[PDB]
């Protein structure tokens, strides 16, 4: 199975790519039968390891700023939907500062007989309240999610300068209408420094490097 990773790091966010990437190579879908493609939307002229690893697909993306950079997240993915349909069976979006800390495998893949969607519980809320930092699914289902959310944003994009929507309320509305096949615990979006019962699986990195 071909697993596509969607990753936006415009502007100063590109600093998070190297360790996200290294941790993914170490921990994400370790079983060599899986083939991972990285789709990295950035204004950076060159990403770490890009010259060595052709699974790293740098996609040219203008730096956007509030509200657009997260508000237009799904618009950004859809620019290459044709490429994504031909090259992937699954798609997962990870916020720039996420870091894998332990092995993740096929348990996060929505089965083909499900609605094909994955969402993640917001760590602050531990009918779920979903966080925007991690979502995904089979390629066809996730692209339908993108198209739907894109349509909602576009309703206001011209006439409303101040947005009504935010990427997070958008994903919560989507998952309300379409309860995802898989809902991951906040262990997959564990804010560094927080007191939560479980062990972190994916960490939201804070500002201090070890």
Q: Which residues bind Ca ion (CB under 5 A)?
A: 206, 208
Q: In what order do the strands lie in the sheet with 35-42?
A: 56-60, 35-42, 2-8, 90-94, 134-138, 117-120, 182-184
| Alpha helical stretches, state H, the chain | 17-27, 68-71, 73-78, 81-87, 139-157, 167-177
For residues 108 and 92, give the distance between their C-alpha atoms in angstroms, rounded to a whole number.
10
Rounded distance between C-alpha atoms, residue 15 and residue 75, angstroms: 23
Decide: helix, strand or coil at residue 110.
coil
Considering the complex, what minimum distance in angstroms separates the CB of residue 18 from Ca ion?
14
Tell the smallest beta-carbon distance from residue 40 to Ca ion (Å): 22
Cα–Cα distance measured from residue 204 to residue 98, given in angstroms and rounded to the nearest whole number: 5
Tokens of 31: 């079983």
97 vs 135 by CB, closer to Ca ion: 97
Nearer of residues 171 and 203 to Ca ion, judged by Cβ = 203
| Token representation of residue 50 | 């890009």
Compute the distance between CA of residue 80 and CA of residue 128 in angstroms, rounded to an integer.
Answer: 30
Determine the angle formed by the axes of helices 139-157 and 167-177, rounding to 10 degrees.
120
- Smallest gap from residue 208 Cβ to Ca ion (A): 4
Query: For residue 182, how far is the Cα from the chain centroid?
Result: 15
Q: How far is the CB of 16 from Ca ion (least distance, A)?
A: 12
Q: How far is the CB of 101 from Ca ion (least distance, A)?
A: 12
Which lies closer to Ca ion via its Cβ, residue 13 or residue 41? 13
């Amino acid at each position: 199975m071909r697993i596509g990773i969607l990753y936006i790091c415009t502007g100063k966010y590109d600093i998070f790519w190297k360790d996200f990437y290294l941790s993914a190579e170490r921990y994400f879908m370790q079983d060599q039968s899986f083939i991972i493609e990285y789709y990295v939307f950035t204004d950076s002229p060159k990403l770490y390891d890009e010259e060595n690893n052709k699974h790293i697909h740098r996609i040219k993306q203008k730096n956007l700023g509030w509200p657009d950079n997260t508000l237009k997240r799904f618009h950004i993915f859809l620019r290459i939907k044709e490429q994504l349909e031909r090259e992937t069976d699954y798609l997962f979006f990870f916020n720039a500062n996420l870091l894998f800390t332990s092995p993740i495998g096929k348990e996060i893949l929505p089965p083909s007989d499900s609605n094909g969607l994955l969402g993640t519980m917001h760590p602050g809320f531990y009918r779920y309240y979903y966080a925007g930092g991690l979502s995904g699914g089979c390629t066809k289902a996730y692209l339908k999610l993108c198209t739907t959310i894109c349509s909602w944003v576009d309703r206001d994009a011209t006439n409303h300068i101040i947005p009504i929507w935010h990427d997070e309320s958008l994903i919560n509305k989507y998952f309300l209408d379409n309860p995802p096949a898989i809902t991951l615990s906040p262990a997959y979006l564990y804010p560094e420094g927080w007191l939560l019962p479980f062990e972190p699986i994916i960490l939201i990195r804070d500002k201090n490097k070890p």
